[PDB]
Amino acid sequence: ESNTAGDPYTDYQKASGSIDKAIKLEARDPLVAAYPVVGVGMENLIISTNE
Amino acid sequence: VQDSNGESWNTGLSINKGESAYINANVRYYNTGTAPMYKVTPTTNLVLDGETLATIKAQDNQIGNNLSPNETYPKKGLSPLALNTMDQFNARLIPINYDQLKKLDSGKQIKLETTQVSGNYGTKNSQGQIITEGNSWSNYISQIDSVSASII
Amino acid sequence: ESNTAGDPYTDYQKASGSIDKAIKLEARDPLVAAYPVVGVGMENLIISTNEHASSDQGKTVSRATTVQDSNGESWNTGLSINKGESAYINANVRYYNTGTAPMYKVTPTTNLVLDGETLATIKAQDNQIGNNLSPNETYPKKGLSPLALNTMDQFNARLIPINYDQLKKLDSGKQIKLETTQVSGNYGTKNSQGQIITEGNSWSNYISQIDSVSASII
Amino acid sequence: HASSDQGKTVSRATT
Ligand SMILES: [Ca+2]
Ligand SMILES: [Ca+2]
DSSP, X not given: OOOSSOXXXXXXXXXXXXXXXXXXXXXXXXXXXXXXXXXXXXXXXXEEEOO | OOEEEEEEEEEEOOEESSSXXXXXXXXXXXXXXXXXEEEEEEEEEEEETTEEEEEEEOOGGGOEEEEOTTOEESOTTSXXXXXXXXXXXXXXXXXXXXXXXXXXXTTOOEEEEEEEEEEEOOEEOSSSOEEOSSOBGGXXXXXXXXXXXXXX | OOXXXXXXXXXXXXXXXXXXXXXXXXXXXXXXXXXXXXXXXXOEEEEEEXXXXXXXXEEXXXXXXXXXXXXXXXXXXXXEEOSSSOEEEEEEOOEEEOSSSOEEEEEEEEEEESSSXXXXXXXXXXXXXXXXXXXXXXXXXXXXXOOOBOBOSTTSOSBEEXXXXXXXXXXXXXXOEEEEEEEEEEOOEEOSSSOEEXXXXXXXXXXXXXXXXXXXXX | OXXXXXXXXXXXXXO
């Protein structure tokens, strides 16, 4: 497999570090996947009553 | 022969019952993975008392360009976004009818839940420019999820 | 035949497992088709009746002379309704995948039926599209609330209307049914560089071709 | 477009 972890980057790209420099160090091991986990959290809510 | 002097003052208040109020959510994005997401555009459900009021996808006003791991959009010292509209061109406000407004004028709260997030990853093209346009993260989500173990 | 099963993947790509890793393993047999089976199920429906309610008050003072004094009050309340645009419909739905392949960019088309007539035929626009849908899964996922099918416009700006007769027979024993007429989505292939591309890859190009060379088992 | 309206009124006049 060229992509052991299944992410868009190959084993050599990851191990060699020749990827996005913002990827965590963890994810330059070919067994740990470069994978973002995004979540939204609401702060407050506003109600405009249109009378 | 007669005279007269009159005077009056009316006051009125009308309402629509299918467009009784507009909702504005203040949200913030988080990233707890190992890779940054470009052009972050989440999709969220607004749930009120067991029924979904609206499912909103992030349009241009609410898209975050960069989201590095362990960071938030907007950044730590800024105020949250305004999840304000529901249409494609950011020109249509999120409505609620009269019964939802009446139960919302009580202990009932609106919950927000992320149903999905789409974004881009970065690659270097033929000449060494980083490209993050045709590189959709949602092409690899199922494939990474199916060949791995999850740790938190 | 390079594609015995009639799916986007050849015999070697299937047999050697050199395909999307989310494909079920049975679908890597050249005789079993990689094939998503997506359906929509409504969970509840919400009616927003758009009547214009009104209310006003008043006071009056008057003095006449030929001496005469008067004072009065008043209050009025009204209700207006359009009979072709009597209410708005909001269906909470959820997509299921019971096939062998994941579908990307799921876009279902659904009829909303009430007492033997289709009120609307809605195709999922940006707010209702599911990015990923793996086999034996749902969108939204198991622990989340269902979507909201609010709009019929292409740009998610026109709400789904019902007229006065449908609204009156909807506040009775009659229920609205939802049925999926078709689902359009994408499949994944690797281009020159090992990047997965799911954009020019339509599943509908293969549906009618898989349904004509195969036997169905459920 | 249908509409239905109701209203009340009280008064008092002194000579
Ligand atoms: Ca390798
Ligand atoms: Ca063959």
